[model samples]
Target: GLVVSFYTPATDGATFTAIAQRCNQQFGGRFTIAQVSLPRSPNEQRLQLARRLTGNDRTLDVMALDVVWTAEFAEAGWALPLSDDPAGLAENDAVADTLPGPLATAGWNHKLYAAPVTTNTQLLWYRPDLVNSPPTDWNAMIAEAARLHAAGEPSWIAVQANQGEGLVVWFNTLLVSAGGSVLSEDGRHVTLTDTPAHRAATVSALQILKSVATTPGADPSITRTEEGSARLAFEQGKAALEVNWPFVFASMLENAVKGGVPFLPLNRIPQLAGSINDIGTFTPSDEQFRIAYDASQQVFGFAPYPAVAPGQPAKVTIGGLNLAVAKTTRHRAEAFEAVRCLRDQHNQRYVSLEGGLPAVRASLYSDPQFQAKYPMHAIIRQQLTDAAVRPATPVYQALSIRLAAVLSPITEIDPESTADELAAQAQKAIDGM
Candidate 1:
C-alpha cells in the first residue's frame, strides 16, 4: 500500500483519526492514509506547513489548509490542482453541494485547488438574565452592555481583539458588515479608500471598534483577548455576551456542570475573592452567585452575530479548513483519493457532531441527528449562507499582520487616521513590505 501523509491540525484529532481509518479501509491495499498532527493554534499550524511545503518536503502529501490559505498555497505551487486530480473532486456533486462561501474559498486564479471540508461563522452567545432580547446590531449591543454595567452586572461583551488572526477576523467582520471590502473584486489589490462608499464604510467600522474598546461595554482584557479568552469570560460569568463559533455552546454546558462553579452552598469571602482574582469576574453577592451558578448549567443563549445596523443580517467572517494534495507528493493519485475520503459527507457529519465543527454541505443542517446533537446548527447554517470571506490573495498573511496591528487595541484607533493608515499599510503589505 502507498503511504499518503496527512498534515492537519490536532484540534479535532479523534474525528480525523476515525476519518483516516475509514479512508484506509476503503482504499483496501492500494494506499494507507497516515495523519501527522500539527499544532492546535491556526497560526502555528500555518507556519509549520508553510515551512515544510516551502522546502518541497515530500512527506507532506495531503494538507488541511485554512480557507484563507488556498490562494496563497496555489500561487506558491505548493498544492496540486484538483481539476486533474484522480479523485474527481472538481467534477463531482461534492463541489456542487458545498455551501457557496466555503467552496468559493477553494478556487484560486480561476482554478480549484482543494475541497471544502468544513465551514464556520461566529454567533452571538448571551446570558438571558442580562437582557430581555439579544442586541440586533453593534450600537444596540454597546448600549445594552453599558446599561448592564451601570447596574453592576457582568455586562462586558467578550470578543477576540488580539494582535493576530483573531484581530483581523474581528476587523474583517466589522468592515464587511458595514458594506466594505478589504480587496478589490479580483483580489489583486487593496480597496480601502477615497470613494464615498469606501470612506463611509471604513470610518464607520473603525468608530464602532473604538467604541467597543472605550465604552465600559468591552471585556477589560480586550486588547489581548483571543477566542479562548472570550470563552473563559462568558463561562466565568464575567461577560453577559460572547461572539464566537458554535463549539463554545458545548464547552459552556460541560464547564457549568462541574469543576469551577465554586460558589457552593455557603458564603466564604476568601473563596469568593479568590474566584474573582482567578477569573476576573465582576463579583456578585453570595446569594446572587448561587443563583447565577445554578443558571449556568443551562448555558447561554445563541444568536447570529450582531449587525452593523438594525434590519440587516450581520456579515460574519467565516472560518474553516480545506484539504489539498501537495504538489511535491510522489503518490499524487493516492493523495488526491485520500483527500476525497477525508471530505465525504459521513466525515463531515462525524466532525460536526463529534468535533463541534460546522459542515460545508448544506444538507447537514437538515439532518435529524445533526440537528438533535448540534442545537446551534440552524443559526450556523443561516450565517454560513452569507458569511463574509477574507480577501483571497497570495499576500493575505502579510496583509492580515499589518491590518491587525493598525486596528488592534481598538481603543487607540482614531477612525479617520486609522482609515488612512489602513490604505498605507495595506499597500505596503501588498508590495511585500
Candidate 2:
C-alpha cells in the first residue's frame, strides 16, 4: 500500500478526512491517503511548504496550492506534470470546461502542473433597502454611497485595502476591470508601462483607492480594513455597498440569528440541499445549512463586483485552491490517482457544498440543484469567465508585496503623476526576483 499526505487548511480537515476515507475504500489496498492540516495563514503555509520542498522532501506527496503559486511551483519543478491521462479526463481536456481564469492559474509555459478544484471571486454586496439599484461601475457606486451618507446614515462603501495580499487582489481586479493587465500575456515583460490601457488602469485604480480611503463615502477605517474587518463593517450596517467573498452572506445570517435581530424568511435566501440523498461524498452540517438558508435577500443583494468604468465587463479577482502532485513523491502513480479522485466532478460538487466554494467545472454552475441552493452561482460563473489572476510568475509574491507597499498609501497617489512610478517599482521588484 502507498501512504501519501495531502495538505489543506485546518478548517477543511473534516471534509478531506471524509474524502480520504472514500478514496481508500474505492481504491482499497492500492493506496491510502492521510490529511495534514497546514497553517491558516497562506503566506506561512507557502513558506513551510517551500522549506520542505527545498530540502527535496519526498514524503509530502500532494500539495493544496493557492492558485497564484502555479508559475513558481511549476517553474521550480516542484510539481509533477499532469497531462497523459485519457482524453476528456486529462487535466488539459478538463481545462476546456473549467473557468478560463482559474484554468490559467494551473498552467505555465503551455503545460499543466495542477488541477483547479475550487474557485472564488468577489461580489458586490449592497443594502438593497438603502440603494435603489446596484451600480455597475465604481463611479456610480461612489455616488450612491455618497447619497446615502448625506441622507443621515452610515452609508459608506466597504472594501479590503490593508497591507496584504487582499490589496494586491483588489488592485489586480481593478486593473483588469479597466481593460489592462499587469504583465504581458506571455508573462515575459511588465506591461504596466507599455500600453495606454495599462496606464489608464493604474491611474484609475489609484484614484479609486484614494477616493475610498480619504473620502466621506468610505468607511472611517477603510485604510486599515481587510476582509474580516470589512465584512464586519458591512454587517454592522456601516456601509451601503461592500466587495467581498460569498461567505459574507452566510456570516451575516449567522450573526443576525445570534444577535436576535429579525431575519428574513428561509425561502428568501439560498437553501442548501434539502435532503441528504442529494449527494453522497459531502454534506453540509446543520449550522452551515442554517447560515445559508436564513440569509436575507431584502437586506442584502449580490451582484458582480463593479467594473472600473461604464460599458466594461467586470474582471474580479480569481481565488481558491488547486491540487498539485509533487514531483518528489516516491508514490507518483498513487499520488496522481489521489488527485484524480479529488478532482472528480462528484467530489468537486461535494467539496463545493461543504466548503462554500464555487466549483471550477462550468457545468456545475448550471446544475439545477446547485443553482437553487446557490443563486449566487450564476453571477460567480460570469465573473470567473473574465476574472484576472495575479501575475503568473515565480516572483508573484515579491511583486504583490512591493505593489502593496507602494500603493497602500492612498494619500500620495496622483492619477497623472503616480502611474509611471508604480509601474517602475513593480518592474524593479520583478527584476529583483
Candidate 3:
C-alpha cells in the first residue's frame, strides 16, 4: 500500500529499474517498491547508511550492502536477522540454495543477515598474441613476464596494487590461496601465528607480493594502479597480463568499437615493451572503428586466476552486493518478501544477461545462453566456487586499513616483518583501537 525504499548503488544499464518494476508488478501493490539510489563512492555510501541506520531510520526498509559490510551491519543491529533456524539462513527457500562462496559472505555469527544478489572474482586476462601458453601460478607468471621483458616484448603485469581495498583484495587472494588466512576461522583476531601452516601462507603471500613488485616485468605504476587503471593500461597495449573481472570483456570490446588502437605491430606481438606502452599515445584518425574490431579479439584472452602455488588452485576474493532488510523497518514481512522476490532466479538471470553481472545462484551457471554470452562462464563459475572470502569482522574495516598501511610500497614488503606488523595492528583493531 506504501512505498518500500530500497537503497542501492546504480548498477550497469537499467537493470535496477527493471527489477523494481517487475517486483512491484508481481506483488500487486502489497507495497510499491522503489530504489533510492545510493552514492557511487563506497565510503560515502557507508557513511550515509551508517548514520541513518544507526539512528533507526524507519523509511529505510531494505538496502543493498557490500559483502564486506555484512558483519558490521548485522552485529550493529542495523540489519534484520532473517532466520531463527539452526542453519542461520533467511527463512526463504530460494536463499537456501545460494552458492557456497556468496552464502558464506551472507552470514555472521551463525546468522544470515543478507541475501546474495551477485558475486564477482578475478580471472587471468592475458593477451594470446604475447603469451603463448598462460602460466598457472604466480611463480610461473613472474617467470613468463620476465622472459618477455628480457626479449623486449610486451611483458608488464597489470594488477590492483594501489594502497586501498584493491591492495587488500590482492593480498587476501594470495594469502588464502597460499593456504593462509588473515583472521581465525572464528573471526576474532589475526591468524599469522595460530599455526605453522598459517605462518607459511602469510609469509609466502607477502614474499610473492614483494616479488611481483620488485621484479623485472612489474608495472612501473603498479603501486598506484587500481582495477580500472590496470584494465585500461592492458587495453591500451601496455601490459599483456591482467587479473581483472568479467566486465573487462564487453567494455574492452566497446572501446575497440569506439576508438581503440587498430592493431599492435600488424596483429603480432610488439617486439619492444617500450612500443607497447607508448603505442596508445598516438592520436586516432576519424576512420571507422572497424580498424580495431578484429584487433580486440587478437589481443584479449581470459582464464581462471592462476594457482597460488604448484598443484594449489588460486582463491580470489569474492565481491558484489547483498540485499538486507533494515532492522527498524515497519514493513518487516513485506520487506523480506520483497528481497526474496528481488533475488529470485528470473531477476538474477536478467541482471546477469543484461547487466553483465554474475548471478549468485548456481542454476544460472549451467544455462546455455549464459554460457554462450559469457564465453568464459565456465571459468567464472569455477573461480566463484574456488573463491576466497575476505575476513568478515565487525572490526574488519579498521583491521583492513591497518594491514593495507603495513603492506604498502609493495617493493618494501618483507614477508616476516610485514606479517608481524599486521598481527600487532590487527589485534589492536579487534581490541577496539
Candidate 4:
C-alpha cells in the first residue's frame, strides 16, 4: 500500500512518523510512505484539505482527515468512499474492531470514508490518596468535591471550562452525559435550543464552574495553554481532580522527581451509552491501552469520564482522528491495502504502540496482560461502551463554531449568570442556524 499523508505535526505527526517507520521496518516495501504538512491547527488542516481538492492539486494519494470532517470532505469531493473499493473494509472484522464513536465519525450517510488511527477520549483524573472510594455518578462526585473543599483541602475537580477548545471539550462531554444530542437524527438541524437535556447539561456544566473548581486566577488560563501548567499543578499535587487525555501520563512520569506526587491510581467513570438520537458508544481494550498510552505520551491516572455537572444522563464523547482516502488517488488498491494493514490486528497493535492509540476493536478491551498494567483500561472500556460521538453533519462544523461563540463568553464564571448566558446563547446559536 502507498502511504497516505497529512500534516498534524504537534499531535499526530510525531506518532505517524513512528508508524511509517514501523510499517516499513516491519513489513518491508509493502508500504511506501509519504507526508503532507498543514498549519498546526485543526481548522487550518481542514482548510488545506479543502484547497487541495478544490485547487485541483491531486498530489496527495491518500489523505488523513479528522473524524469530524468526514461529512464535509465526502460531500466536497475531497474524500473517497471506502465502500467503493469492494474491499469490504467497513465490514472487515479488523476495521470493525474500532470503538463506535470513532467508527461513526468515519462514515457519512452510512458510507465509511475514514477510519480512526488514534483515539483521544476524555476521562477523569483524581488523586487516589484523597479519593479513597471514588464517586459513581454526578451527584456523588459533587458531594465528594464539596466534602474535599469543606475540609480546607484543595479543589477536587479540574475541568477545562475556560472559553476555547478546552471549554468545548468539557461542554460536549457534559451534553453527552445528559442525554442531549447536538443535532437531529438526520444530522441536518441544531437541536440544542428546545431540548431540555441540553439545558440541563448547560446547567450541569455551570455547576462545576460554580462549585469548588479551581479559579482562573488560581490556575490561570495561560498555564493551561502555555508551559503545561495544569500538568505541573497535577504533578505537584496542588490539585485534587483533573480532566485530561491519556497523553498526560507521560508528563506525570517525567515530572515525578523528588517531592513530586508519585504514581496515583486514576479512575475513569464508565460513560453513559446511547443518547436522544442515533448516537452511541463502545469500549477500548488493553492492547489499545498500551498503544494509546505509549503512542503520544504516557498517562498515569485515567478512567472513563465522570459526570460532576448538573445533569448526568450516562454517556460521553470519545475524541480522536479518523483516516480517509483521497477521491483523486491514482492507486486506490494500494491505498486500501494500506488501510487493511492499518486495520489488521498485528498492524494495529504496531500503530497503537507507535501512535499510542486506544484500540477500536471490541475484543481488545479484554486482554488480561493489558488489564493488569493499565487498570484504567477497564473503566475506559466501559465508558467506551457507553461513549457518544458528536453529530456528523455537513453543517456540524459551522454549528460547533456557532455554539462555541455563544458558550465561550459565559463558561468560566461561577454562577447562574454563566448558565443563563450559556442557555441564552445556546438558543440563539441553535436558532441562528
lDDT by residue (tens digit), candidate 1, 259-356: 54332222333433433323332334445444544555344688889999789798889899888888879887788778778878888887775566
Residue 390 alpha-carbon offset, candidate 1, angstroms:
1.0
- Could you give candidate 3's per-residue lDDT for residues 1-433 as a string of tens digits? 9888888875432567678889999987678888887776445567778988878788888888888999998999887787732343356653666788888788888878888988888888888888998889999889988988897877778885577677888999999998899888778767975788998999999988898887686677755534347778887887888887776775565455444644343324232222222323222222312343345557778878888788867988998888888876887777877888888888988777555578888877888866655677888888887788888888777887888888887888888888888788888887892
Indicate the residue-level lDDT of 341 in model 3: 83
| Best-matching candidate per lDDT | 1
lDDT (C-alpha, whole model) for all candidates: 0.78, 0.74, 0.76, 0.57
Number of backbone clashes in candidate 1:
0
Tell me which of candidates 2 and 4 scores higher on TM-score. Answer: 2
Which lDDT value does model 1 have at 3?
90
Better of 1 and 4 by lDDT: 1
TM-score of each: 0.88, 0.86, 0.85, 0.76
Q: Point out where model 3 deviates above 4 Å.
A: 10-14, 40-43, 84-90, 94-96, 223-228, 261-297
RMSD of 1: 6.8
The 10 consecutive residues of candidate 2 with the worst lDDT sum are 273-282
Between the candidate structures 1 and 4, which one is better when assessed by TM-score? 1
Candidate 4, residues 340-366, lDDT tens digits: the string is 655556645544433455656655567
Candidate 3: C-alpha RMSD after superposition? 6.9
